[PDB]
Design an enzyme around this catalytic site. Structure first.
Site, PDB file in Angstrom:
ATOM      1  N   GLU A  47       7.446   5.248  10.879  1.00  0.00           N
ATOM      2  CA  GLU A  47       6.003   5.277  11.097  1.00  0.00           C
ATOM      3  C   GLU A  47       5.605   4.346  12.233  1.00  0.00           C
ATOM      4  O   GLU A  47       4.714   4.665  13.027  1.00  0.00           O
ATOM      5  CB  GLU A  47       5.271   4.901   9.811  1.00  0.00           C
ATOM      6  CG  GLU A  47       3.859   5.443   9.727  1.00  0.00           C
ATOM      7  CD  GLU A  47       3.761   6.655   8.826  1.00  0.00           C
ATOM      8  OE1 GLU A  47       2.677   7.272   8.770  1.00  0.00           O
ATOM      9  OE2 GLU A  47       4.770   6.994   8.174  1.00  0.00           O
ATOM     10  N   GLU A  52       0.826  -1.200   0.000  1.00  0.00           N
ATOM     11  CA  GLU A  52       0.000   0.000   0.000  1.00  0.00           C
ATOM     12  C   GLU A  52       0.863   1.253   0.000  1.00  0.00           C
ATOM     13  O   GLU A  52       0.541   2.236  -0.677  1.00  0.00           O
ATOM     14  CB  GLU A  52      -0.944  -0.022   1.201  1.00  0.00           C
ATOM     15  CG  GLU A  52      -1.749   1.242   1.390  1.00  0.00           C
ATOM     16  CD  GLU A  52      -1.079   2.212   2.336  1.00  0.00           C
ATOM     17  OE1 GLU A  52      -1.161   1.998   3.561  1.00  0.00           O
ATOM     18  OE2 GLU A  52      -0.467   3.187   1.855  1.00  0.00           O
ATOM     19  N   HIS A  53       1.961   1.235   0.755  1.00  0.00           N
ATOM     20  CA  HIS A  53       2.915   2.337   0.712  1.00  0.00           C
ATOM     21  C   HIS A  53       3.463   2.528  -0.693  1.00  0.00           C
ATOM     22  O   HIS A  53       3.503   3.648  -1.215  1.00  0.00           O
ATOM     23  CB  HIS A  53       4.057   2.065   1.686  1.00  0.00           C
ATOM     24  CG  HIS A  53       3.924   2.774   2.994  1.00  0.00           C
ATOM     25  ND1 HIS A  53       4.410   4.046   3.203  1.00  0.00           N
ATOM     26  CD2 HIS A  53       3.366   2.386   4.165  1.00  0.00           C
ATOM     27  CE1 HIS A  53       4.158   4.411   4.447  1.00  0.00           C
ATOM     28  NE2 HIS A  53       3.526   3.422   5.052  1.00  0.00           N
TER      29      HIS A  53
END
Ligand SMILES: CCCCCCCCCCCCCCCCCC(=O)OC[C@H](COP(=O)([O-])OCC(O)COP(=O)([O-])OC[C@@H](COC(=O)CCCCCCCCCCCCCCCCC)OC(=O)CCCCCCCCCCCCCCCCC)OC(=O)CCCCCCCCCCCCCCCCC
Ligand SMILES: CCCCCCCCCCCCCCCCCC(=O)OC[C@H](COP(=O)([O-])OCC(O)COP(=O)([O-])OC[C@@H](COC(=O)CCCCCCCCCCCCCCCCC)OC(=O)CCCCCCCCCCCCCCCCC)OC(=O)CCCCCCCCCCCCCCCCC
Ligand SMILES: CCCCCCCCCCCCCCCCCC(=O)OC[C@H](COP(=O)([O-])OCC(O)COP(=O)([O-])OC[C@@H](COC(=O)CCCCCCCCCCCCCCCCC)OC(=O)CCCCCCCCCCCCCCCCC)OC(=O)CCCCCCCCCCCCCCCCC
Ligand SMILES: CCCCCCCCCCCCCCCCCC(=O)OC[C@H](COP(=O)(O)OCCN)OC(=O)CCCCCCCCCCCCCCCCC
Ligand SMILES: CCCCCCCCCCCCCCCCCC(=O)OC[C@H](COP(=O)(O)OCCN)OC(=O)CCCCCCCCCCCCCCCCC
Ligand SMILES: CCCCCCCCCCCCCCCCCC(=O)OC[C@H](COP(=O)(O)OCCN)OC(=O)CCCCCCCCCCCCCCCCC
Ligand code: HEM
Ligand code: HEM
Lengths: 440, 418, 54, 32, 98, 55, 47, 51, 55
Positions: free
Chosen positions: A136, A59-60
């Site tokens: 993150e 997804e990143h």
């Protein structure tokens, strides 16, 4: 327009199905904007121990360059026409939706076709993204809400894929290579597991033509998950340096199916939510919230309804100081068993109205409508019309709420996750004893 | 079906309604009684008034208000900017009448009982602490204090020296001098005009005049710097752009979107944003720059907002500023201008689509402009902006008194004279 | 004070044997003892509250 | 990180009914 | 007339002889402390001093001189407006409860 | 609202005595004798009374 | 607010850390601050 | 007192009648068992042989 | 470092029950009976025991 007529006047969600298995669906409106996005059935629930975190990684990488669109060129498109490209990956769903103008749907769908099919997975880009994901993860470590919810998931579904977090362990993050990412996208981003939702001013036939012109060369016509097991446990990450103590207590709830969700939500609507910066304070109908405002027991509390495909978590999460965890556990369990044993009719009516407001007001704006479309065609298998929701809420009464709460709350082993100065937090035996009433 | 029907009442009120046949209907009473009207002896009164909803009114007690609002499962939210508060109620279109009655009681006949206000005054500290957890709140408050002299300088939040000393008489005077029938707009989404007119004649009969007129917010150009110690230095450097609803305002908005205002693709690179590209060629550390545009009724503030690491902050302030200077001499590609115009038109339309956003937009239009213009008119106005105006825009920003607000470990942040 | 006097009356009556002069006095004393506590005192309190403008 | 932690296996203490990961425990909750 | 009987009962009660007023002698039921708390500062201070003086007098078994007695027409029901509001709020809460 | 166990003074004393008293988790069986003594005492008293009623 | 907003109000509690460029994206205010606190809704700020 | 009764209290009573009646039955059975109440115990089948 | 009267547990209870207990300033002689009964109780016990040793 007496409400019910307004509910009937809501336009319906037309649903189609491509030959590849793509469930193209659209809801037509008159707004000059739109939100179009694909929802895929990938997530951490379908991730093994070694693959854990591959969904977040892909997804990143999705937005950072494709094959046809090299790198920022893709982004160069999205900003050029004012589109807002966004994504989110839940434990069982993934989605990439592009807010755009109604006249930019032909291009936007194209971009989506590039994102999910012709991805890049550039090795150097993978290396740049690995440290970003690590930082993150470090940022999320300070998120005392997300950390507590992940603790609850781990301690409730221990030994099952549902216990896995979305981002995955840092070990997997550093270990993951390009081969794992491409294998994951090739195995999970299959056409039958994708739904191309599009809300706003998009005509369904135009959406169908666009999908057939772009999403045609997808997979033809397999991880189907395993029924996870609930295990009433507790995790106590005692850390007295933390200012507040986040606690989350849940029970095995229903799934996306099992209509008992509708009454159960009503029960949660009865308990409600509260925090320090609220309005009426010691006047709100929720006895829990009224007591909390009266004695300032906490700074926040909520009732969640996290429900997965076959199981789900139903319970509460409260943020309070170190000296008031026992009192709020007492009051929360007292409210739960008050609903369980004698729910009354007036509170049920209030819960029905609150649930009506939640469903109605939540579905405003193109983004929530499109998200509802994509999530409903995956979970329920059908976009449940608001009229059906109204009827299901109407069928709920005091006896139904009492019965369903007895089924899911009374004499059940809960899963507890506390983080912070949680020394006061009663031992699991005391909590389990609070899960049953001697008077009743 | 239906249109945003507009009718200005003889009192001075403007009622506009839009029956969209939505399952839920919202009503917003927009009052031109923001924080810019606070004088020096009553600062923070507007804040408490924002939290003063749900207190015992003349016709409905606080218990009755809370129970009636939430038994239906409705809404009572006060959204306050520097120039205009807005009470908002939301429920199903079936129970709108009770919500309207409660809103009108809380906005037209408040009591401000002594014990109620005394108890409520503790919530001011909690609200300030919760809002100030975000450093942008502190930075923007310092910016407004250091940019405007008298009117707009007042904070949205009660200063710490006034918490506990907001007397009920102050609230009564504020309401009587600002909650006037000629300074408000009862905006309804999901209702009909006759119903909104009946509630207008129901109470809605304060002094009817224009209330206590404010003062022209003079420019200061000062620099407020606080050292809070958190690593991420937030800095913001602005100059007096123009009043809202003007050709210069549209040019400044176009310039904002040329420079870059927030991200579009989540976790992208802000390639279009010229400021981000200019700064990224300098500091190679986590940062975030964006054009900050504020457009109030009397004046405005256009500048750059930079979140940066403590050591690199100065560079982030310098190069980004230089980037604006690059536009000042004239380096604006017409492709960039067209892209910024498209971004502006999008952002506007996607802000209007939401029911709440539509309500706020119509309320602001009614208060400031006094009329309502369809989105096509706004898009045409944006399209009418030429490149020469965006070039002014840059010259006005570059050559003017610069007000700067900074927060963090300010060991290397440049001063206004630097 | 009437209640107290009734208490002493009951004590004296209990001291004396059970004959015609004492039986009726005992009945009246018992009835009065219950009546003052359960009836006279609350109604009198209502009368006083009314008499004192509250 | 919080994700790094995982609940240790209890398989040698768990009852026979609730011992399989690919099977819900609500059915055996009544029996236990 | 009834006012004569009210005056007679006021004189017979004797709380005026201590300098007290009617609302100074009310039993503090759950509503009464809330009513007292809402009193303005000056009334609260006067009330607390008057009660303190009454307790001082009763400790010595003495009364105020005849001159300094709260006359029946000068007696003020300072608490009554607040007590009425407290009772009304309690009644409203009870009615919503049922 | 307050919990009766933690608000009623008698129940408050009982609660702090042997309801929520923080006790070490690793005390061996040898501590139980303490309670036994009290138990024995209570039993003794009862039996003593029923002996003092015929002696 | 049937819905409890999104982020609640944990006063006397640390904010979400930062320390990544992507996570720090667009945190730079671009519009004037507005505050929204009301009956049965968590307080919020928007810039 | 009259402050009770009304809509909400009657369904509370209805909800708690089954549990209260079961507790009353518990008390009755415990009483008849504790004192060995003959009058009832010459009727239950298997315990008749106790006497 | 601190007075024993309000630091020792038994002494603390005795202090805040009989020494530093805030009592009304104008309690009449009737209130004294509350003490007398208790004293009578002790006088009933202490004397009564001495009858039990020859009864
Ligand atoms: C008998 C069946 C139960 C019954 O008739 O009434 C149950 C009822 C309690 O009902 P509940 O639903 O468990 O109350 C939950 C409340 O939150 C009140 O409890 P809590 O949430 O504050 O604390 C949880 C727990 C905390 O645990 C305790 O309080 C320990 C109870 C005693 C354990 C033995 C050691 C200490 C002595 O409470 C209890 O266990 C209840 C204690 C009182 C009832 C039992 C008394 C036994 C005396 C011997 O008992 C009473 O109200 C007491 C009087 C009647 C029972 C005794 C006669
Ligand atoms: C087979 C031949 C050898 C038998 C065991 C001999 C021996 O010395 O065992 C010590 C051994 C404990 O040794 P330790 O770990 O040094 O002491 C732990 C404490 O005694 C505390 O240990 P606990 O919490 O398991 O309680 C044990 C306690 C339980 O009994 C009592 O607390 C009362 C004792 C007096 C009655 O009894 C004793 O400590 C004395 C020994 C009792 C007879 C064995 O006894 C046991 O583990 C219990 C055995 C029970 C029968 C099976
Ligand atoms: C001269 C005409 C006769 C005057 C006394 C009779 C009478 O009705 O006086 C009422 C007259 C007016 O009553 P008050 O003083 O308004 O109310 C009684 C005080 O609140 C409470 O009483 P107090 O603290 O103001 O005065 C204590 C008083 C009376 O003390 C008591 O009444 C409580 C202890 C003794 C009980 C009776 C023992 C005989 O002491 C004595 O009378 C002398 C020593 C008696 C033993 C120690 C006490 O009181 C007195 O004359 C003195 C108290 C009552 C004496 C009997
Ligand atoms: C002798 C019986 C009491 C001692 C043994 C049982 C005990 O200590 O606790 C169990 C029992 C049930 O109550 P418990 O679950 O502890 O608390 C109330 C529900 N939350 O607690 C009890 O007090 C049970 C006996 C009274 C009912
Ligand atoms: C001796 C040690 C054990 C007893 C003391 C400690 C336990 C608490 C007091 C007894 C008890 O169980 O009370 C139950 C109940 C309490 O009230 P409730 O509204 O249920 O809960 C909130 C207030 N505690 O109070 C009740 O009266 C419940 C109703 C009667 C019982 C059924
Ligand atoms: C106080 C409780 C009783 C204490 C003494 C025990 C004996 C007693 O008084 O009654 C015992 C009685 C046993 O059964 P019983 O009633 O004798 O059966 C034949 C009836 N003709 O059983 C009972 O009387 C049980 C009922 C006792 C409470 C009254 C109703
Ligand atoms: C501290 C607890 C007690 C202990 C250790 C204790 C100990 C004893 C002992 C050892 C005997 C002799 C028994 C025998 O020789 O047969 C005895 C007898 C007796 N005790 Fe106690 N006792 C206690 C409490 C009481 C109490 C509280 C009473 C009064 C209520 C009482 C009344 C008697 C009587 C009447 C006897 C004579 C009956 C007999 O000897 O069997 N005892 N006690
Ligand atoms: C509550 C307090 C008490 C009261 C009201 C009380 C009352 C009485 C009374 C009225 C008598 C009869 C006296 C007589 O007729 O001569 C008596 C006798 C007796 N009491 Fe008590 N008593 C109390 C406490 C005690 C205590 C604590 C004991 C034991 C230590 C005790 C042991 C006796 C004995 C042994 C007798 C018989 C002695 C005699 O013939 O007078 N009493 N009591």
């Amino acid at each position: 327009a007496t409400y019910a007529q307004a509910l009937q006047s809501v336009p319906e969600t037309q649903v189609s199905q491509l030959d590849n298995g793509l469930r193209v669906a659209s809801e037509q409106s008159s707004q000059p904007t739109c939100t179009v996005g694909v929802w895929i059935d990938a997530g951490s629930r379908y991730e093994n121990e070694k693959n854990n975190g591959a969904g977040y990684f892909v997804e990143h990488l999705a937005f950072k360059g494709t094959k046809n669109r090299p790198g920022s060129a893709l982004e160069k498109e999205v900003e050029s026409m004012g589109a807002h490209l966004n994504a989110y990956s839940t434990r069982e769903h993934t989605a990439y939706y592009i807010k755009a103008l109604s006249k930019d749907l032909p291009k936007a769908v194209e971009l989506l076709a590039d994102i999910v099919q012709n991805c890049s997975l550039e090795d150097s880009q993978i290396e740049k993204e690995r440290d970003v994901i690590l930082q993150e993860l470090q940022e999320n470590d300070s998120s005392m809400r997300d950390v507590v919810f992940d603790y609850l998931h781990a301690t409730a579904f221990q030994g099952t894929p549902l216990a896995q977090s979305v981002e995955g362990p840092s070990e997997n993050v550093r270990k993951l290579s390009r081969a794992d990412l491409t294998e994951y996208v090739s195995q999970h981003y299959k056409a039958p597991r994708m739904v191309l939702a599009a809300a706003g001013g998009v005509e369904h036939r135009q959406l169908l033509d666009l999908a057939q012109k772009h999403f045609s060369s997808l997979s033809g016509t397999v991880p189907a998950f395993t029924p996870c097991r609930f295990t009433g446990s507790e995790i106590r990450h005692r850390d007295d340096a933390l200012p507040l103590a986040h606690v989350a207590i849940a029970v095995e709830g229903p799934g996306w199916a099992n209509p008992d969700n509708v009454p159960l939500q009503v029960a949660n609507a009865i308990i409600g939510h509260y925090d320090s910066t609220y309005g009426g304070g010691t006047h709100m109908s929720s006895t829990l919230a009224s007591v909390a405002a009266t004695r300032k027991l906490c700074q926040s509390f909520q009732t969640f309804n996290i429900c997965y495909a076959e199981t789900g978590l139903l319970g509460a999460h409260f943020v309070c100081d170190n000296m008031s965890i026992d009192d709020m556990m007492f009051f929360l369990q007292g409210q739960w068993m008050r609903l369980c044993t004698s729910a009354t009719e007036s509170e049920v009516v209030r819960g029905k109205n609150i649930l009506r407001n939640a469903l109605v007001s939540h579905l405003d704006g193109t983004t929530p409508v499109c998200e509802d479309i994509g999530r409903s065609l995956l979970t329920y298998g059908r976009r449940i019309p608001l009229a059906e929701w109204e009827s299901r809420i109407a069928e709920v009464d005091a006896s139904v709420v009492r019965e369903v709460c007895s089924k899911y709350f009374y004499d059940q082993c809960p899963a507890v996750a506390g983080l912070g100065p949680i020394e006061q937090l009663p031992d699991y035996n005391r909590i389990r004893s609070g899960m049953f009433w001697l008077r009743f | 079906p239906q249109d945003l029907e507009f009718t200005r009442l003889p009192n001075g009120l403007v009622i506009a309604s839009l029956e969209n046949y939505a399952p839920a209907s919202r009503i917003g009473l927009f009052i031109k009684a923001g924080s810019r009207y606070e004088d020096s002896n009553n600062l923070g009164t507007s804040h408490l008034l924002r939290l003063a909803s749900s207190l015992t009114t003349k016709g409905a007690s606080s218990f009755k208000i809370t129970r009636g609002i939430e038994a239906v499962g409705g809404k009572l939210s006060v959204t306050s900017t520097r120039e205009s508060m807005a009470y908002t109620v939301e429920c199903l279109r079936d129970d709108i009448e009770i919500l309207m009655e409660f809103l009108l009681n809380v906005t037209a006949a408040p009591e401000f009982r002594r014990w109620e206000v005394a108890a409520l005054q503790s919530q001011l500290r909690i609200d300030k602490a919760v809002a100030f957890q975000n450093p942008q709140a502190q930075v923007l408050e310092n910016l407004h204090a250091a940019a405007y002299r008298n009117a707009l300088a007042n904070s949205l939040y009660c200063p710490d020296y006034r918490i506990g000393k907001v007397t009920p008489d102050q609230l009564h005077y504020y309401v009587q001098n600002h909650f006037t029938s000629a300074r408000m707009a009862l905006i309804g989404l999901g209702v009909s005009h006759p119903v909104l007119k009946q509630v207008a004649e129901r109470f809605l009969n304060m002094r009817g005049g224009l209330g206590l007129s404010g003062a022209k917010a003079k420019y200061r150009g000062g620099e407020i710097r606080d050292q809070n110690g958190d690593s991420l230095v937030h800095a913001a450097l602005v100059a007096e752009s123009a009043a809202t609803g003007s050709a210069e305002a549209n040019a400044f908005s176009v310039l904002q979107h040329v420079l870059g205002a927030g991200p579009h693709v989540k976790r992208g690179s802000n390639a279009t944003s010229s400021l981000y590209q200019a700064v990224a060629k300098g500091v190679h550390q986590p940062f975030d720059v964006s054009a900050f545009n504020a457009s109030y009724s009397d004046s405005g503030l256009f500048g750059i907002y930079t979140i940066s690491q403590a050591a690199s902050a100065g560079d982030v302030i310098k190069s980004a500023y230089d980037q604006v200077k690059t536009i000042a001499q004239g380096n604006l590609s017409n492709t960039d201008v067209q892209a910024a115009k498209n971004k502006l038109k999008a952002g506007y339309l996607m802000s209007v689509e939401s029911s709440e956003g539509f309500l706020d937009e119509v309320g602001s239009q009614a208060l400031v402009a006094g009329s309502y213009v369809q989105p096509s008119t706004v898009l045409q106005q944006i399209d009418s902006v030429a490149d020469a105006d965006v070039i002014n825009a840059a010259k006005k920003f570059v050559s003017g008194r610069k007000s700067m607000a900074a927060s963090g470990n300010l060991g290397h942040t440049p001063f206004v004279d630097e | 004070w009437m209640l107290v006097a009734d208490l002493i009356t009951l004590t004296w009556i209990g001291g004396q044997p059970v004959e015609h002069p004492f039986i009726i006095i005992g009945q009246l004393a018992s009835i009065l003892y219950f009546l003052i506590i359960l009836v006279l005192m609350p109604i009198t309190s209502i009368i006083e509250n009314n008499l004192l403008k509250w | 990180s919080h994700t790094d932690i995982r609940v240790p296996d209890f398989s040698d203490y768990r009852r026979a009914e609730v011992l399989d990961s690919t099977k819900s425990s609500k059915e055996s909750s009544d029996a236990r | 007339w009834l006012e004569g009987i009210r005056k007679w009962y006021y004189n017979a009660a004797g709380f005026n002889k201590l300098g007290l007023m009617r609302d100074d002698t009310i039993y503090e039921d759950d509503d009464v402390k809330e009513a007292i708390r809402r009193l303005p500062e000056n009334l609260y201070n006067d009330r607390v001093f008057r009660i303190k003086r009454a307790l001082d007098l009763t400790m010595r078994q003495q009364i105020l001189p005849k001159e300094q007695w709260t006359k029946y027409e000068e007696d003020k029901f300072y608490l009554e407006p607040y007590l009425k509001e407290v009772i009304r709020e309690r009644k409203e809460r009870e009615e919503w409860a049922k | 609202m307050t919990n009766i166990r933690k608000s009623h003074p008698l129940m408050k004393i009982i609660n702090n005595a042997f309801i929520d008293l923080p006790a070490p988790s690793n005390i061996s069986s040898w501590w139980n004798f303490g309670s036994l003594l009290g138990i024995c005492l209570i039993l003794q008293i009862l039996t003593g009374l029923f002996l003092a009623m015929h002696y | 607010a049937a819905l409890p907003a999104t982020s609640e109000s944990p006063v006397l509690d640390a904010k979400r850390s930062f320390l990544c460029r992507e996570s720090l994206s667009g945190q730079a205010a671009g519009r004037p601050l507005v505050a929204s606190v009301g009956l049965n809704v968590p307080a919020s700020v928007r810039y | 007192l009259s402050r009770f009764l009304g809509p909400r209290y009657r369904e509370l009573a209805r909800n708690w009648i089954p549990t209260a009646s079961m507790w009353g039955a518990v008390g009755a059975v415990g009483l008849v068992w504790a004192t060995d109440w003959r009058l009832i115990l010459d009727w239950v089948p298997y315990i008749n042989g106790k006497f």
